[PDB]
Design a protein around this ligand. Structure first.
Ligand SMILES: [Ca+2]
Ligand SMILES: [Ca+2]
Ligand SMILES: [Ca+2]
Ligand SMILES: [Ca+2]
Lengths: 221, 221
C-alpha cells in the first residue's frame, strides 16, 4: 500500500503534494527536510538511501513503488542497485539529471525514468514562437484544469473487447480523446484505425470529467 | 532571427541540441561552458546576464526570443528585469525552480514559464502504477517518434474558416488528433464540438508525418 520516496529534490515536494492521503515514507539524510515532509502528511525516515540497511528501515520490501531522486545520477544508480538487492520485483521510478545516464538508470533496475531537464529543454526550444506545446503539457497535469489526462482500463468482458478503434468511435461517443493505448510496459500513441482492443489494455485519454464517465460506462460488461 | 540564451543549466544543453542550425548566442559567466556551447554550433558570450550592458553585448534587442535559466529564481528574475529595461516587447521564456516563484517570473516580464520540477513531480506521482502519462509526454517531444506534436496554423482564406470542430471531422479525415487549438496567449485543450475555427487559430495536433500533410493541405484555401 505504501510508497517509499528516496532522497529529496524540488521534484519530490510537488510529488508529495499529489500523494496527500496516500501513505508515503520519505527516506533522506537531510534533517532540514523533516519539517517539510511532515507538513505534507507524509512520514520521514532519516537515513542514507544508498545503504541497504536504511532501505530496509524505510520498508522498501512490499512497497508498491519506490521513487528515487538523489543529488546526482551516480548516487541515484547506487540507490537502485541497493533496492534491487532487497526486492527485485518492486516498481522503481527514477529521476535522471543528464540524458546520457538514462540508460544506466534503466540498467541498474529502474522501470521508468523521468528526465525533467530533457523535457524542459525540449519544451523551451518549442516555445520560441508559440508556447502551446508547453501550455498543453503543464496544463493537463494540473489538478485544476477542466480537461485532464486519465488512464481507463478495458475490463474483462468489456463491450469493446474485439472492437476496432475505428468501429468504437470513442471520441464521437464519449467526448474523450484517445491519445494512446498501452499494455504492460508498451504504449501506442495515436493508435491506427484498425487496432483492436483487448481486455487489459489501458486507454490513455483527455476529457472533461463527465466525458470520462460516459467512457467508463461505455466500456464495462 | 537569432535567439539569446541567458545562463547555463542541464536544460540548455538539451535546448541547444534542438536549435542546431538556428543562430544562438549563449550569454553566461562560466567559462567552463564555452567548449560545450561551441560544439553545439552555437556562439558563446562571456558575461553577467543580470547586467544590462552584457545583455546589450549578446544583442538582446531584436532577438526573436530570449530564454532565461539562471542558478536561482531570484537571479532569473534579476535577468528578466534587465532584459525589460532594454527591449520591452521581446519574447522571454524562463525556467522556474520553485513553484512559488512562477508568478514572480511572469510578473517581472516572462511571457512563458517552464517548470521542469513541477512537471517532473507531477509525472512521478502519476507513474506509481502505470507510467503511461510519463511515457506519452517524454515520447511526443522526442525527434525520433513515429508520432509527433505539431502546431499547424489556419491560414487566411482557409477552407476551414467558419467550420465547426465537429463539422471538420479532422481526425477521421487527416488521421491527426486535435489536442487543442490556441490563439495568441490562450490555449483551449480538447475543444468542444461547437468551436468554430478562425484564420489565425493554431491547431495543436499529434500524428504521423503524412497525416500532418493531409492536414496542412486540408486547410489552405
Ligand atoms: Ca510551438
Ligand atoms: Ca471533449
Ligand atoms: Ca498513472
Ligand atoms: Ca493517426
Amino acid at each position: 500500500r505504501h510508497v517509499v520516496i528516496c532522497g529529496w529534490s524540488e521534484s519530490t515536494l510537488e510529488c508529495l503534494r499529489e500523494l496527500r492521503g496516500s501513505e508515503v515514507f520519505v527516506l533522506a539524510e537531510d534533517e532540514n527536510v523533516r519539517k517539510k515532509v511532515l507538513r505534507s502528511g507524509a512520514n520521514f525516515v532519516h537515513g542514507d538511501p544508498t545503504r541497504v540497511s536504511d532501505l530496509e528501515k524505510a520498508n522498501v520490501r512490499g512497497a508498491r513503488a519506490v521513487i528515487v531522486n538523489l543529488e546526482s545520477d551516480s548516487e541515484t544508480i547506487h540507490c537502485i542497485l541497493g533496492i534491487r538487492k532487497i526486492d527485485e520485483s518492486v516498481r522503481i521510478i527514477a529521476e535522471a539529471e543528464r540524458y546520457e545516464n538514462i540508460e544506466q538508470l534503466r540498467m541498474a533496475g529502474a522501470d521508468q525514468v523521468i528526465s525533467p531537464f530533457v523535457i524542459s529543454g525540449r519544451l523551451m526550444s518549442r516555445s520560441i514562437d508559440d508556447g502551446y506545446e508547453a501550455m498543453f503539457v503543464q496544463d493537463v497535469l494540473a489538478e485544476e484544469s477542466t480537461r485532464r489526462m486519465v488512464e481507463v482500463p478495458i475490463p474483462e468482458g468489456s463491450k469493446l473487447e474485439g472492437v476496432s478503434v475505428l468501429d468504437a468511435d470513442i471520441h464521437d461517443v464519449t467526448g474523450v480523446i484517445i491519445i494512446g493505448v498501452g499494455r504492460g510496459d508498451e504504449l501506442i500513441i495515436d493508435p491506427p484505425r484498425d487496432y483492436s482492443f483487448r481486455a487489459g489494455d489501458i486507454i490513455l485519454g483527455i476529457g472533461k470529467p463527465e466525458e470520462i464517465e460516459r467512457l467508463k460506462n461505455y466500456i464495462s460488461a
